[PDB]
PDB file of C-alpha atoms in Angstrom:
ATOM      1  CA  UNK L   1     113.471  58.901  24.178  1.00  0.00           C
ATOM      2  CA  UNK L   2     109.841  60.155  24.806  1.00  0.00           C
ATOM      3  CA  UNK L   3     107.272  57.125  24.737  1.00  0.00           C
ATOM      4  CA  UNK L   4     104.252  59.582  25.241  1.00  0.00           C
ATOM      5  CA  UNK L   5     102.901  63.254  26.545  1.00  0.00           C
ATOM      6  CA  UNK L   6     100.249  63.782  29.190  1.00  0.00           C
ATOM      7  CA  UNK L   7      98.339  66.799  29.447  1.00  0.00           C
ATOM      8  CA  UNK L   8      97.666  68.539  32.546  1.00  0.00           C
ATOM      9  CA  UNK L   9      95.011  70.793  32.518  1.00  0.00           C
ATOM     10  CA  UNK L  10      93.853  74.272  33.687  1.00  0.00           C
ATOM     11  CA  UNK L  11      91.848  74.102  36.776  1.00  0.00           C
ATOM     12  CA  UNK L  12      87.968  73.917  36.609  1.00  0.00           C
ATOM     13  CA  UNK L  13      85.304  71.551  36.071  1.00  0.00           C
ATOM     14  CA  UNK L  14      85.585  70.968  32.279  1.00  0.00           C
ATOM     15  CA  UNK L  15      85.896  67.911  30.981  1.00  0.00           C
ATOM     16  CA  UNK L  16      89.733  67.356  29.819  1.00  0.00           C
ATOM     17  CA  UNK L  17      88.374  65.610  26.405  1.00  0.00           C
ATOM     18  CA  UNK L  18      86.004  68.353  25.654  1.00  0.00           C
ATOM     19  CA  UNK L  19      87.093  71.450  26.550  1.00  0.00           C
ATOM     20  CA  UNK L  20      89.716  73.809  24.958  1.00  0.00           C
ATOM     21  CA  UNK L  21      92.227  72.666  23.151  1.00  0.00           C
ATOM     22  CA  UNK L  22      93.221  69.180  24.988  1.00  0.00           C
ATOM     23  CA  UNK L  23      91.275  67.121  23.067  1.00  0.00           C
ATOM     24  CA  UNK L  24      92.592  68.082  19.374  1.00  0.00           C
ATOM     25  CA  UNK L  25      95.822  68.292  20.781  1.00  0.00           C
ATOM     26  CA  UNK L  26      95.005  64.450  21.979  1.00  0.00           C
ATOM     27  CA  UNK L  27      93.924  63.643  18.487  1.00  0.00           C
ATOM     28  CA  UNK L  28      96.640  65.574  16.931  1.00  0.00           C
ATOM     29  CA  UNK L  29      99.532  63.516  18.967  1.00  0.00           C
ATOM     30  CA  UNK L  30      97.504  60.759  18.748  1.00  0.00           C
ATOM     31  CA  UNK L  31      98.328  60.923  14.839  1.00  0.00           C
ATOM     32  CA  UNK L  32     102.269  60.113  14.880  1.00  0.00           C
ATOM     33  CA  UNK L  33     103.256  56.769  14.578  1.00  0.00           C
ATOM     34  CA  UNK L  34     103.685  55.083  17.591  1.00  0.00           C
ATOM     35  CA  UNK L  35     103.052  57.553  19.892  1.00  0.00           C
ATOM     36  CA  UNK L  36     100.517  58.015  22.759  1.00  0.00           C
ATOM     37  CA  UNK L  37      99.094  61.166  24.635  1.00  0.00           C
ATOM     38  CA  UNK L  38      97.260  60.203  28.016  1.00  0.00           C
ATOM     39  CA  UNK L  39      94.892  63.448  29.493  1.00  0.00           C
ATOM     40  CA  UNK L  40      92.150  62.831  31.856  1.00  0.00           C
ATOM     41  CA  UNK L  41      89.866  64.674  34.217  1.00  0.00           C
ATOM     42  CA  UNK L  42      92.169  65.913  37.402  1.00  0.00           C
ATOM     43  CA  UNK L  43      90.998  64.987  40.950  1.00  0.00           C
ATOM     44  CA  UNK L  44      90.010  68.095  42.725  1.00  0.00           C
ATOM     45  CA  UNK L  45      89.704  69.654  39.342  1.00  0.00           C
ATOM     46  CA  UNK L  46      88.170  73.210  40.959  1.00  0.00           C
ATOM     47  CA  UNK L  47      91.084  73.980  43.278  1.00  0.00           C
ATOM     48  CA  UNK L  48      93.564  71.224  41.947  1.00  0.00           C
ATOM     49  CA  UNK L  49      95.589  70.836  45.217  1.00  0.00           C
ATOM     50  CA  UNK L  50      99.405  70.297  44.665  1.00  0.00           C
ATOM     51  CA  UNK L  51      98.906  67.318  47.377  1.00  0.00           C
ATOM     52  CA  UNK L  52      96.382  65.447  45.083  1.00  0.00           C
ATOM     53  CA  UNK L  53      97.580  66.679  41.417  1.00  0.00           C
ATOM     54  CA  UNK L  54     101.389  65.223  41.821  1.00  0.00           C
ATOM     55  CA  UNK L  55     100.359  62.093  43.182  1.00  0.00           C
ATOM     56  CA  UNK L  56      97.546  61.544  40.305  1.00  0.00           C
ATOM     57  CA  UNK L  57     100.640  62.874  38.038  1.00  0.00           C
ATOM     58  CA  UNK L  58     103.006  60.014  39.134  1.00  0.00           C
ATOM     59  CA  UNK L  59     100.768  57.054  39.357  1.00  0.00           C
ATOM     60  CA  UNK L  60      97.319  57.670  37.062  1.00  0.00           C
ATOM     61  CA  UNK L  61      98.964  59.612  34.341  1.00  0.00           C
ATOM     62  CA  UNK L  62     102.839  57.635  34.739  1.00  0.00           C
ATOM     63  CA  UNK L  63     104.993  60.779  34.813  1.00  0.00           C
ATOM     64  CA  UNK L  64     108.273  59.580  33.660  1.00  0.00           C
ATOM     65  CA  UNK L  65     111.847  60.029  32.154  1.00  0.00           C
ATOM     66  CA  UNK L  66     109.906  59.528  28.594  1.00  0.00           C
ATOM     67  CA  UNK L  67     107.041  61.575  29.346  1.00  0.00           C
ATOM     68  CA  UNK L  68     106.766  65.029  27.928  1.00  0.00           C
ATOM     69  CA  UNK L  69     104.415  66.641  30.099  1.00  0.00           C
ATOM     70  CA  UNK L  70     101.990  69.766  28.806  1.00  0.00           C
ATOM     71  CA  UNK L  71     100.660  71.803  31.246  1.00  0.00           C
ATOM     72  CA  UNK L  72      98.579  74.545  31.192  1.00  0.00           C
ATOM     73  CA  UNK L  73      97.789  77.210  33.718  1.00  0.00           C
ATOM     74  CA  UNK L  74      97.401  75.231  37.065  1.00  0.00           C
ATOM     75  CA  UNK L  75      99.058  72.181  35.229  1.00  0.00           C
ATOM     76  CA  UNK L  76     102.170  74.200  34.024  1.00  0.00           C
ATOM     77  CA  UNK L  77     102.174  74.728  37.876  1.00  0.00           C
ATOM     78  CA  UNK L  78     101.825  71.198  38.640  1.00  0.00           C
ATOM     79  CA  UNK L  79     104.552  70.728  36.195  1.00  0.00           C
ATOM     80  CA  UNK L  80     106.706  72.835  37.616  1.00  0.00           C
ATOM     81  CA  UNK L  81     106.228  71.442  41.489  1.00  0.00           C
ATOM     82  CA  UNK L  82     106.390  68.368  39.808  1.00  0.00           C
ATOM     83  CA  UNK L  83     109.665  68.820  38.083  1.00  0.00           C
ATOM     84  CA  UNK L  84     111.006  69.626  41.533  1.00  0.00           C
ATOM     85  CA  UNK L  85     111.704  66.103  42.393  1.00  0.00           C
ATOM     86  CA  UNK L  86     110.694  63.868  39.352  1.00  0.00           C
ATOM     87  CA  UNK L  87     113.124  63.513  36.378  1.00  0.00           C
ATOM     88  CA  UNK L  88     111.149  64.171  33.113  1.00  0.00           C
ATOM     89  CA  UNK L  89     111.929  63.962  29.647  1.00  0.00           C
ATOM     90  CA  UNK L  90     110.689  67.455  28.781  1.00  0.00           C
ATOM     91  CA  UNK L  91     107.955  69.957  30.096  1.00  0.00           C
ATOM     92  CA  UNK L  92     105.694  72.266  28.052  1.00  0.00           C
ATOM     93  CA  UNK L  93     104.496  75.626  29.870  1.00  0.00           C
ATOM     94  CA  UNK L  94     101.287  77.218  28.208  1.00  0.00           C
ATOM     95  CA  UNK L  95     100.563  80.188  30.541  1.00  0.00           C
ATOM     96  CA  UNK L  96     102.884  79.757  33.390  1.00  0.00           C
ATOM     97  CA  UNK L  97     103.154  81.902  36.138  1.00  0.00           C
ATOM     98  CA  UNK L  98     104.670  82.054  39.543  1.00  0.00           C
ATOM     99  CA  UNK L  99     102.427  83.191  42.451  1.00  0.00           C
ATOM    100  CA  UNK L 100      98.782  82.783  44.012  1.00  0.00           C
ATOM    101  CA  UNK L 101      97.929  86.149  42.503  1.00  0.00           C
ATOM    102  CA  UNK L 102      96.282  87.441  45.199  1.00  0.00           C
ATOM    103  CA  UNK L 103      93.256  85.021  44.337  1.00  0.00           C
ATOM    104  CA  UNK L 104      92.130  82.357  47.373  1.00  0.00           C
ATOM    105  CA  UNK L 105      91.786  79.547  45.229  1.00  0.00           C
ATOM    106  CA  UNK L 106      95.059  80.134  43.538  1.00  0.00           C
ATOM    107  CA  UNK L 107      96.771  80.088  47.457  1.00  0.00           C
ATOM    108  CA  UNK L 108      94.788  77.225  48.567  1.00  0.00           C
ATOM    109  CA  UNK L 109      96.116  74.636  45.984  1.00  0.00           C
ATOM    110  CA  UNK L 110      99.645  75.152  48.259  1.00  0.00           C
ATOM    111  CA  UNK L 111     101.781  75.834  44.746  1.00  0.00           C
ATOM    112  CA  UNK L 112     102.946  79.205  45.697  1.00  0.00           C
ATOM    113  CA  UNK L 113     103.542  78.715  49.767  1.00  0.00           C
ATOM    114  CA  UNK L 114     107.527  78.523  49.737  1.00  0.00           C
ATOM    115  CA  UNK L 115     110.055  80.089  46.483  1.00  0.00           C
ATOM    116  CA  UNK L 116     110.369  78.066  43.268  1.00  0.00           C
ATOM    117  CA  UNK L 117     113.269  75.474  43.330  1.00  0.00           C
ATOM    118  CA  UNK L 118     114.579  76.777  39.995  1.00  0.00           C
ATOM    119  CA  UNK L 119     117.725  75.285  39.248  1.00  0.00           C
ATOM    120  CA  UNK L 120     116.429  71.640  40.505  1.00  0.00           C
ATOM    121  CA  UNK L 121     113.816  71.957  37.825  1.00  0.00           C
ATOM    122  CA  UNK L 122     116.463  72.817  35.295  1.00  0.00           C
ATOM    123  CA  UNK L 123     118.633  69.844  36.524  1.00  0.00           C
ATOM    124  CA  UNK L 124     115.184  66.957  36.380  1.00  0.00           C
ATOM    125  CA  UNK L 125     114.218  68.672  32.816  1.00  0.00           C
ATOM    126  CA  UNK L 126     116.367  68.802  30.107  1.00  0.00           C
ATOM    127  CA  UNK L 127     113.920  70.808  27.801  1.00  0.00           C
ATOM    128  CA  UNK L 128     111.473  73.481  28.903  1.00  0.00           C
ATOM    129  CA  UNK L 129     109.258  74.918  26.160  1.00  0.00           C
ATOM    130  CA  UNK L 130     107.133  77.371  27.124  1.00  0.00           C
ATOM    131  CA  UNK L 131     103.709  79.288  25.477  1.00  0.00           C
ATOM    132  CA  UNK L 132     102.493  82.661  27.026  1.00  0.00           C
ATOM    133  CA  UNK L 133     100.555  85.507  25.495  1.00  0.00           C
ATOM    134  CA  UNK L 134     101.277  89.196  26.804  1.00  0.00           C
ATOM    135  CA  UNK L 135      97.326  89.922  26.278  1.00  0.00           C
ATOM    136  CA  UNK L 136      96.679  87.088  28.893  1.00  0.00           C
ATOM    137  CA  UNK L 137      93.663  88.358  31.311  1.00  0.00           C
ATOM    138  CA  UNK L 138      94.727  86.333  34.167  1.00  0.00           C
ATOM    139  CA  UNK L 139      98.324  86.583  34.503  1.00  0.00           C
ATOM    140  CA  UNK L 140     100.802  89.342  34.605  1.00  0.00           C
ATOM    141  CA  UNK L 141     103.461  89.040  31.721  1.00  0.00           C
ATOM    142  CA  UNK L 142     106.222  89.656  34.129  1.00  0.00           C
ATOM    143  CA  UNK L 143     105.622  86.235  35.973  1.00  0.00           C
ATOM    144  CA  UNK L 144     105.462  84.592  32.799  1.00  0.00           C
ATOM    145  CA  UNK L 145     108.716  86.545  32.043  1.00  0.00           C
ATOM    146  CA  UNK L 146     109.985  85.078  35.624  1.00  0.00           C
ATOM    147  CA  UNK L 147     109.449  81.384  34.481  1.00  0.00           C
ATOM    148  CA  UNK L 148     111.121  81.674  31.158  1.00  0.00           C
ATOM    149  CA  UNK L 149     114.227  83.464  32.645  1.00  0.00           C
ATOM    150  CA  UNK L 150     114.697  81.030  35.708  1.00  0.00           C
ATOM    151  CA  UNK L 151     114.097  78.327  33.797  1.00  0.00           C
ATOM    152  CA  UNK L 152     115.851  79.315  30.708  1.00  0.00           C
ATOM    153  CA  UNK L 153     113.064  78.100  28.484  1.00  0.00           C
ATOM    154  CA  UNK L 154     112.566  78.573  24.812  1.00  0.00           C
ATOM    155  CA  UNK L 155     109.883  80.899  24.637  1.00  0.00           C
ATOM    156  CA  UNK L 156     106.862  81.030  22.492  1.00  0.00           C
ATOM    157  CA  UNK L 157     105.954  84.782  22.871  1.00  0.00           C
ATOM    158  CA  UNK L 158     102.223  85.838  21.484  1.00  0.00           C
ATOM    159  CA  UNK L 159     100.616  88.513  21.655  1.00  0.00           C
ATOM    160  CA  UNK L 160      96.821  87.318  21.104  1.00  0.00           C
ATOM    161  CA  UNK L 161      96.474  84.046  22.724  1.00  0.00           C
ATOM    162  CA  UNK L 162      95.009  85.105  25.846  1.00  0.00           C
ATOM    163  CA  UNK L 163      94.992  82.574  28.457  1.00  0.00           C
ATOM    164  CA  UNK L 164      95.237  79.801  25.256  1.00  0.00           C
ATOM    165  CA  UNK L 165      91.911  79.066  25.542  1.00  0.00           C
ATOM    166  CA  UNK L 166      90.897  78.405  21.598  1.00  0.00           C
ATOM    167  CA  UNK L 167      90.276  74.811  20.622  1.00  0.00           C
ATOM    168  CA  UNK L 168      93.091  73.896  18.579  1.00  0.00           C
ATOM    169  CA  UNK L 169      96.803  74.544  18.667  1.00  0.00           C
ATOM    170  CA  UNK L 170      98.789  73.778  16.039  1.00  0.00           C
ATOM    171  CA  UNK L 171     102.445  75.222  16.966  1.00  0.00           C
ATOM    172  CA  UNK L 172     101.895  73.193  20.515  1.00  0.00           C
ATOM    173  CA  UNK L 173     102.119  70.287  17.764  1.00  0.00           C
ATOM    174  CA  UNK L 174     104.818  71.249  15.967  1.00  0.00           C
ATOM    175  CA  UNK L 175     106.420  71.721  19.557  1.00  0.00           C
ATOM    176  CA  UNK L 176     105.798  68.404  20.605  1.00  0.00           C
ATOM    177  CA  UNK L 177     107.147  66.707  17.042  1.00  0.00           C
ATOM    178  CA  UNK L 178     110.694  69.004  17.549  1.00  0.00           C
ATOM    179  CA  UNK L 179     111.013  67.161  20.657  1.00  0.00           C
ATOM    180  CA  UNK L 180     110.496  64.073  19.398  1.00  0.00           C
ATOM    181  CA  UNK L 181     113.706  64.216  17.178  1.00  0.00           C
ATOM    182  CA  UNK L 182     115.504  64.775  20.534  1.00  0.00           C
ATOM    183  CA  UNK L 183     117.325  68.195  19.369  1.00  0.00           C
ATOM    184  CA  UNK L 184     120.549  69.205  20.321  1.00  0.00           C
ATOM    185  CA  UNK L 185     121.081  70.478  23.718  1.00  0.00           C
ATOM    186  CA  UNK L 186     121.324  74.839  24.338  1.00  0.00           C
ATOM    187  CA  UNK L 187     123.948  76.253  26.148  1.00  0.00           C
ATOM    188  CA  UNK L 188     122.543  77.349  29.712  1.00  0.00           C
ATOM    189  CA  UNK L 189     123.261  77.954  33.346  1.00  0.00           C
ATOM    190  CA  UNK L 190     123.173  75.276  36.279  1.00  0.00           C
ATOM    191  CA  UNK L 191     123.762  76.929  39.384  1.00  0.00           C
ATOM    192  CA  UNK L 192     123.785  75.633  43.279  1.00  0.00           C
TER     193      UNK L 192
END
């Protein structure tokens, strides 16, 4: 049973409660009955270093079994890593992708140094909902393809969203509540 969701952001100095769509998303969640949504400015916020972002994950923002954690951009990243070797309720992608692409400060957070432990993600995480936008300027569509077919996620294809950037996001809520009624399970694969 999910007790709360905590939203990891993009990377970059904005503040979490201000900018994009975090904070009406906050307010939004913030709505249902007995539920709470934690999101706060990231250490290392500019290059968001996996070393610094999983630790503040576990411990500042209490990463859990009943957490359902939204990430977007660096945090579906963080997300990912995370779900690697922490056990979490469920995990919501907005604009996932899988390598540094090419970019310096993408390959100095240390996310992309060694392959993508798939299947243990799949294993810690029994639901994986992911957003992603084929008009996104900073990712390919074929890594955002590559996290919704090795993870087997239940994908929330657009084709306007960009880099989900606006400042409000309703179907993220209606997301959020579907998980909250715990739906039933989809068939997939769970391989060694």
């Amino acid at each position: 049973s999910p007790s709360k969701a905590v939203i990891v952001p993009g990377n970059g100095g904005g503040d979490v409660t201000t900018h994009g769509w975090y904070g009406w998303v906050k307010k939004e969640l913030e709505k249902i009955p007995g539920f709470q949504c934690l999101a706060k400015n990231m250490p290392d916020p500019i290059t968001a270093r996996e070393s610094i972002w999983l630790p503040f994950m576990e411990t500042e923002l209490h990463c859990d079994e009943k957490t359902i954690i939204i990430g977007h951009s660096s945090g579906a990243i963080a997300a990912m890593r995370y779900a690697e070797t922490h056990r979490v309720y469920a995990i919501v992608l907005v604009s996932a992708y899988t390598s540094d692409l090419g970019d310096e400060n993408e390959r100095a957070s240390g996310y992309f140094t060694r392959p993508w432990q798939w299947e243990k993600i799949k294993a810690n995480c029994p639901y994986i909902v992911q957003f992603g936008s084929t008009d996104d300027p900073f990712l390919p569509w074929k890594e955002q393809q590559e996290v919704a077919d090795r993870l087997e996620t239940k994908l929330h294809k657009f084709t306007d969203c960009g880099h989900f950037q606006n400042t409000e996001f309703h179907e993220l809520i209606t997301v959020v509540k579907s998980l909250l009624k715990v739906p039933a399970l989809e068939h997939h694969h769970h391989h060694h």
